[PDB]
Amino acid sequence: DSDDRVTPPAEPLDRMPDPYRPSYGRAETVVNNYIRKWQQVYSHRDGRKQQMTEEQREWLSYGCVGVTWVNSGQYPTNRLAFASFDEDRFKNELKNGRPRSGETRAEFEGRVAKESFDEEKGFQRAREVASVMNRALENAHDESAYLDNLKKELANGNDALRNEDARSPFYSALRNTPSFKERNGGNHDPSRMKAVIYSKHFWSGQDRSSSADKRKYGDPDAFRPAPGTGLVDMSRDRNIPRSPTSPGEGFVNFDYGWFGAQTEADADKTVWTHGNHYHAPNGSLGAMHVYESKFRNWSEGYSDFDRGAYVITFIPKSWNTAPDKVKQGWP
């Protein structure tokens, strides 16, 4: 088992990482090196820097996911997730537009749903929402004060989110983050928290009972956002890859990119961190490398992927994994 996953060995918290610099929006370095960097800049609890745990290092090593897991402290639930879809584009392509040489209906339909998505718009949506959620916790020393505050801003912007259920994913989100509840960080005090975003890329046809076509061309009705809110229901995500088209086509099951909480007003220049794959240094896949890619890079990419989710969670405000600016590279 060469392609056995290994956990990276411990870096000293004294040693720096080596020089890297972005090329065309992306930068990258081996996991080892990334750990170094992480310990220098993202590792603080209470302004005081520290090592990546064994456990933390083990998580890191699962790949696409591992930096969201470490940085959020939990494996991604994705319960509160937004996206943007143009329902009007979809229905007017769907029934005034026209397939392309040799493309079937399922094909055609799956494809037009994929492109009726807008990611820039889904990202600012989760980011404007995060801002509201954040102003709602700024001064709020119990969850009540929070929710009340929340409700007011929402209502004031005439936001569809206002009307969400109170066991909804949106309202539950803070009482449901495990760190909320902690002596250590949060402590049932909203004001001790921060909203954070990451993103998942993923496939729409995931059904065992799916017609073959959906599994390979896409489900045009799966993971559509709710048009008022933008919320997407992620419960139907079973982490199943795309089924093959030719034999040339192998597919990953998903991607995950960490944004955190940057202040960067230009969404395009914001940075999305993610490993390439799990760590197999002994093996074919190789070592994990981690990429800090610009947003314009994150939202392009793959083929593998016909849906994108922009998710919110919360971390303690004392942690440094979601700072106001992130840079590409080293330095």
Q: What would the DSSP string read from start to end of 165-188?
A: -SSSTTTTHHHHSTTTTBTTTBTT
**Residues with Cβ within 8 Å of residue 231, at least 6 apart in sequence:** 80, 81, 82, 164, 169, 170, 225
Long-range contacts at 10-19 (CB < 8 A, ≥ 24 apart): 10/51, 10/52, 10/54, 10/57, 11/35, 11/36, 11/39, 11/51, 11/52, 12/51, 13/39, 13/43, 13/49, 13/50, 13/51, 16/40, 16/330, 17/330, 18/330, 19/329, 19/330, 19/331
Look up the CATH number of the domain holding residue 231.
3.90.1360.10
How is residue 89 written in tokens? 């584009």
Q: Please tell me the distance from the alpha carbon of residue 7 to that of residue 221, in angstroms, as a whole number.
A: 39
Question: Which residues carry out catalysis?
Answer: 64, 255, 274
Domain containing 107 equals: 1-331
Which residues are 105's β-sheet partners?
Answer: none
Say how many C-beta atoms besides its own lie within 10 A of residue 162's C-beta.
17
Our count of domains for the chain comes to 1
C-alpha pair distances (Å), 220 with each of 38, 121, 122, 299: 39, 19, 17, 19
Rg (CA), the chain: 20
Name the residue among 323, 201, 198 with its Cα closest to residue 262: 323
**Residues with Cβ within 8 Å of residue 298, at least 6 apart in sequence:** 199, 257, 272
**Residues with Cβ within 8 Å of residue 164, at least 6 apart in sequence:** 170, 171, 229, 231
CA dihedral 201, 105, 247, 239 (to 10 degrees): 30
Q: Please tell me the distance from the alpha carbon of residue 259 to that of residue 324, in angstroms, as a whole number.
A: 10
What is the DSSP secondary structure assignment for residue 85, as one 8-state letter? B
* Resolution in angstrom units: 2.4
Please tell me whether residue 62 adopts helix, strand or coil conformation.
Answer: coil
Q: Please tell me the distance from the alpha carbon of residue 330 to that of residue 328, in angstroms, as a whole number.
A: 7
Q: What ranges make up the beta strands (E) of 117-206?
A: 193-202
Q: Please tell me the distance from the alpha carbon of residue 104 to that of residue 92, in angstroms, as a whole number.
A: 17
How is residue 286 written in tokens? 């190789």
Q: Please tell me the distance from the alpha carbon of residue 190 to that of residue 208, in angstroms, as a whole number.
A: 41
